Write a protein that binds this ligand. Structure first.
Ligand SMILES: Nc1ncnc2c1ncn2[C@@H]1O[C@H](COP(=O)(O)OP(=O)(O)OP(=O)(O)O)[C@@H](O)[C@H]1O
Ligand SMILES: Nc1ncnc2c1ncn2[C@@H]1O[C@H](COP(=O)(O)OP(=O)(O)OP(=O)(O)O)[C@@H](O)[C@H]1O
Ligand SMILES: Nc1ncnc2c1ncn2[C@@H]1O[C@H](COP(=O)(O)OP(=O)(O)OP(=O)(O)O)[C@@H](O)[C@H]1O
Ligand SMILES: Nc1ncnc2c1ncn2[C@@H]1O[C@H](COP(=O)(O)OP(=O)(O)OP(=O)(O)O)[C@@H](O)[C@H]1O
Ligand SMILES: [Mg+2]
Ligand SMILES: [Mg+2]
Ligand SMILES: [Mg+2]
Ligand SMILES: [Mg+2]
Lengths: 395, 395, 395, 395
């Protein structure tokens, strides 16, 4: 059955966060890493939640393009000239963090969709005409279908070989078992029972997820929704491929480090292979999107992606897809995130004038998600067989 | 008033069909005519109705294009790889009929629309700005409007001169008389009395329509919906034209023979002149579409048309249009069918990947429809005057 | 296939009606029969259609109760005082027919419902818990279910034994055969195949139906919608009962004669054994309800019934029920009509103040309906066996 | 995070159930306990799932009243006479279990509502006008509100004092923490923080819940949805009352034993205190309602309640209420179940004719729910203080 932290171990966690912010209450060093940006945002969250639709961290967008400027991205429903703004409502272009670390502030017109289609040979193969199951393939529950993220393997225990996808796609907490079928469930069409979810994460506190206190709100949670489905005993493991169709072979997970310079993650081009839209390319415009609900709980999603060439990055049903960094200097592409599914997982964002608002996509940090679920992504078909061999004699 | 066959004369037809099937229960001769394809389909209908949305006969579609291979087309809601198919679900690629006659089996992704717009000079003329009434012109009842099929003439009796159109467009069996008006009825706009329906066909059994037993179901009916509207006495017959605008003069009806080779009908380019779509071109992809309803009665529609150049072939309101075979070797075009109207008259079909599923149109065999209604199409304006002369002194 | 009268035989029928009204264009004899009332209404229809929602013939309703006064009932959407009426719009209280025959005029506030539930032991028995099939029992098509009217028998030919019900309940002119099942069709629940409709009437002209010209409109039709369903060979005829549950044994059809005094039909209490309402009682408030549609065709329904005790007389699904005259002087009750089904078959009517407007029910003259369908109602279970015996050796 | 049983330990349970059924494949002893009824139902489930909406065990209902006859209740959408039934469709009146144990079969017309208001002084007190919190009081999450079941206490560990309610009311598995507020959440109205859910059950397999194999389906689950909310540290515990308003003091949980005679549970009058409808009385008409979904998994809910005096037993929002057995022989009332919330938690049922179908309510066995959640109901206000005293010094 289900468990939640009690009143104890939460006030102790709340005092550990309040103490961190209490004690630490431009000619300084400019913020250069994600850690500094999140620290400044957390230490100025009270003035940033006043008239904003959300906050994030990334490079400033000026005249529609990234400017390689460390900043906190403040999201507003409608952005007007400061001549028509109240002096209180006007956001400051400079924010000072503890120790003199500072950054700029970006104002972006922003919106959400709410609760979450095209046609190609690749899309049809992923939807069921292919001879192999791999990253990008359709996965379906009895009511919801999405995209297969990656072929993973449990680190400890039985070391089962399975696949990772979005929790909302794979798991419905109104049903006893979360069975998964590739093309469709038996009630909706042809399909083969891939397996059932055996572990899934829904919400992780920011201190456990990032390792720091991303906000002053004691009720701060990350939207890391990932479900691990181990392949069934009767399922044909010979039909599982580790090649991500549309991009090819991939590398190990590129863990996003909060100490690294922002250019290592923000602004880097990404690719994706999903069920609905197939292969699409985009750019990581922001990180650690901070959303504050009307009920007083701070929500975090890791990656913000805007589709390149003004096209969209994902459609409905693309959730649970790998967000893979493209080949930087000719090396293997490396996944960095899974496409988050759920309410307000996508929306409209305003980068450039002379054209309509852009579509933005939220993502979940893949390295931290696998660390929390204790899974290893299988990137080689030879290593896939070894992991199956390692699982056969382990039981 | 209305009549239906009683319990007698329906059983006598029931064992008449059953006897034909009971007694007759690859190194043989391959099927080459529509008769052989329908025979094989009828003798294997039990294993083809299991997991299909319907069945037709035509040339196999491989890679999205016709492959001049005699085959039985099995329509499925979603076509997946046989790796994800149960062995029972998987269809056989070869079917054996009585006497060794055999054919291939083609699996097509299929869907239906249900219960059933563009702008050009031709469309405007057909909708009411033209000086003449002919094939393709708009015809309207008090609630439903459609397309005038062709100018026809009764073979026997009064030899009345009128026009043929779809039964659903012209006839509503909740109203005393089925009055018809060209542009619109008086309650919806300007118009003149074309006349009223005096005879209309709704359903003909397969043994009477095709001359053979197209299926093992005793309740097998052909959806041949054609209504004959003789022109009124006060209607100006001088404004009726036999020229099909958009294609010109036409020839007599090309009767579809079940003995002839499949290439004479299947895969041959067709043209149509209706309303809300004007002149369009398409290809006959299948014949004798067998649809089985949830209530245990087999339904048949003759022609299956997919619009050429990936464009649609008809829209709503095109029902009752001539399906005319285009000029084969420079001779006059000849009509082969009328566009059927009614529930699931059109739908969506999947030939090629890399683009969306295509629209398909159903049609009713024109030669057999006229044989059942005892009408002759007037193809020459000189013959139209003679037919009016023959009708004037006959009364 | 379907047939309709052509241009000929309709102008000849139109001239036979125009001649009747042309040649014949208070101190006289007051109207006393239905014939006189319909004659006066037909000869004054032009001034009665001006600002009325319909017309009928019956006894005048003053202060909410019948007054035993011959009159033409003029139906209005809203009835106001003549002080607020235009002098042209005000209806005349006296109408003069040919030969000096005259009647009063009644203004009744009227409305219609449009396109067409309680619980008792009798209702449950009729809906399927009973051991017998009879008048009032449920009959269901594949999409529509209604009430079994009466057990009938064809006069000529095979002399098949079956039952009569509403055409709209039993007949759908979009389907090949109109199969009937008592409780429910197989796709909706348990049931036995009662048989299929073999003959059904939809519209009969007034000259054929009543024997006179009920109106000046050449396009005048009666709404007689009755369908005869002969019982199947495999159907268990031993389970058919001729007893109308809730009223008992009945007599032969009481044909409504246009020469008789109005008290013989108008104002006489009626009973009905249908379904979704069970046994209900009402009063025949009007006869020959004349409705004029927006398209210029005059429609007629025979019987107008208002439920007694201010309760409703029928609900949706009661269509096809016997309208039976109650025991006048202790003799057997006799059916006079079938409950008509179809658009605007029921509606809301205003008799009395101090309470809401009442519900009215339309009916179809049963004697004329059986004359047109050539059926005899079986009223005795002994006669039912004889009719089955007479049908067994006749084939 | 969430966990589910893997492929192992489920096949081991699957063959454990299969072995029990394979080896054991009226002049015998009649069934007299719930165990025997469920055994016979499990051994005949294949022939009972054919044409039924579900199955339960209890006393036979004949003429609308319980007949103190051990029987298996088979629920049908519509119950008709066997004359209109297919002989295959007709259910047998006698069922034989292993060892000769037998029972009757009762057919009931059944329906379900789907996804789930009165005005009295008691209702207002429960909804928020009262000075104390107890059984029947309103409890609200941020989106769903329901009824407080009972004041409970953890058996082991911290021994926290809290309350039990429905899982669907208290827990939403799309939100980080399941906060609970009595009158309304802060976003919907006044109210204070009662606490948050720290443990909740959703589905328990039948072998763990009942201790037996209630069905042949390997995927058999009991819909036991209960959530425990420990009262907050800052919450005023002095305002919690153990008196169930409308019935008074209660006793300990009466555990339903599968060995005891059927009269101890089935047919016994019950009472309930819910926010929506206040105090209502009903009768336990069936036990262990077996519902089979379209996806092949068997669902079980424990108690079936029909409101007494033909009134309804609960309304929407009454979920999470105590189902309390009324005073049998003057002793203290004892709770036996919690009102289940969720899809198809209630519905409509047909006992008696001459009136509308009755409303039925599903319930969850309280004793087994507390055994699975390890909670003890506090029935005395003096014991409530001691439980709070025991919790204060334990930390
Ligand atoms: N609370 C607010 N709501 C709406 N608009 C605001 C708010 N606070 C500031 N703004 C607007 O946002 C502007 C700042 O925009 P921003 O920081 O994105 O500039 P930039 O990146 O240098 O350039 P650009 O707008 O061309 O991208 C202010 O000048 C003001 O017009
Ligand atoms: N019952 C079924 N439901 C869904 N898909 C099915 C079913 N039976 C077979 N199929 C699929 O249909 C395929 C057969 O396709 P088909 O016969 O149309 O091939 P083709 O014409 O040679 O080539 P192409 O598919 O390129 O047009 C099988 O390989 C299988 O994947
Ligand atoms: N075209 C019309 N539209 C609406 N109301 C009309 C129209 N013509 C007449 N009336 C109203 O109808 C009245 C006549 O009503 P009616 O003939 O039913 O009287 P009654 O039967 O003697 O009495 P009661 O109204 O009590 O039944 C007129 O006085 C006038 O107010
Ligand atoms: N599959 C089925 N679907 C619908 N109705 C059925 C089915 N099988 C049996 N029945 C009906 O249910 C009846 C049995 O009812 P049941 O066993 O409840 O009777 P009872 O309790 O003795 O009396 P009462 O019906 O008055 O409660 C059968 O006679 C038949 O009419
Ligand atoms: Mg900007
Ligand atoms: Mg093909
Ligand atoms: Mg009046
Ligand atoms: Mg019963």
């Amino acid at each position: 059955y289900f468990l939640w932290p009690t009143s104890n171990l939460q006030h102790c966690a709340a005092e550990g966060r309040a103490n961190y912010f209490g004690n630490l209450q431009p000619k300084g060093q400019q913020a250069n890493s994600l850690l500094d940006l999140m620290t400044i945002r957390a230490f100025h969250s009270k003035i940033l939640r006043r008239f904003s639709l959300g906050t994030a961290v990334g490079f400033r967008i000026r005249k529609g393009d990234l400017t390689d400027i460390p900043a906190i991205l403040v999201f507003v429903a409608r952005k007007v000239h400061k001549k028509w703004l109240n002096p209180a409502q006007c956001l400051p272009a400079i924010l000072e963090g503890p120790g003199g670390v500072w950054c700029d502030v970006d104002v972006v017109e922003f919106s959400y969709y709410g609760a979450p289609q095209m046609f190609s040979e690749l899309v049809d193969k992923l939807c069921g005409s292919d001879e192999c199951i791999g990253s990008g393939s359709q996965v379906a529950s009895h009511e919801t279908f999405g995209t297969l993220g990656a072929i993973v393997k449990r680190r400890t225990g039985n070391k089962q070989v399975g696949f990772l996808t979005n929790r909302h796609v794979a798991v419905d907490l109104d049903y006893p078992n979360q069975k998964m079928f590739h093309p469709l469930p038996p009630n909706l069409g042809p399909g083969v029972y891939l397996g059932a979810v055996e572990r899934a994460t829904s919400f992780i506190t920011d201190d456990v997820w990032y390792g720091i206190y991303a906000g002053t709100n004691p009720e701060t949670f990350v939207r890391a929704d990932g479900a691990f489905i181990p392949f069934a005993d009767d399922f044909d493991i010979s039909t599982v491929t580790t090649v991500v169709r549309g991009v090819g072979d991939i590398g190990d997970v590129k863990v996003i480090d909060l100490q690294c310079p922002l250019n290592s993650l923000i602004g880097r081009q990404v690719c994706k292979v999903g069920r609905s839209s197939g292969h699409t390319t985009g750019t990581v415009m922001a990180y650690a999107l901070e959303y504050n609900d009307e009920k007083g709980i701070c929500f975090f999603t890791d990656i913000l992606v805007v589709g390149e060439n003004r096209q969209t990055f994902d459609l409905e049903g693309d959730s649970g897809s790998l967000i893979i960094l493209t080949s930087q200097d000719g090396e293997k592409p490396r996944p960095i995130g899974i496409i988050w599914g759920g309410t307000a997982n996508r929306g409209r964002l305003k980068l450039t004038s002379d054209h309509g608002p852009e579509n933005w996509t939220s993502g979940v940090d893949l390295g931290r998600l696998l660390d929390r679920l204790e899974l290893d992504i299988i990137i080689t078909n030879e290593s896939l067989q070894d992991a199956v061999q390692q699982q056969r004699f382990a039981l």
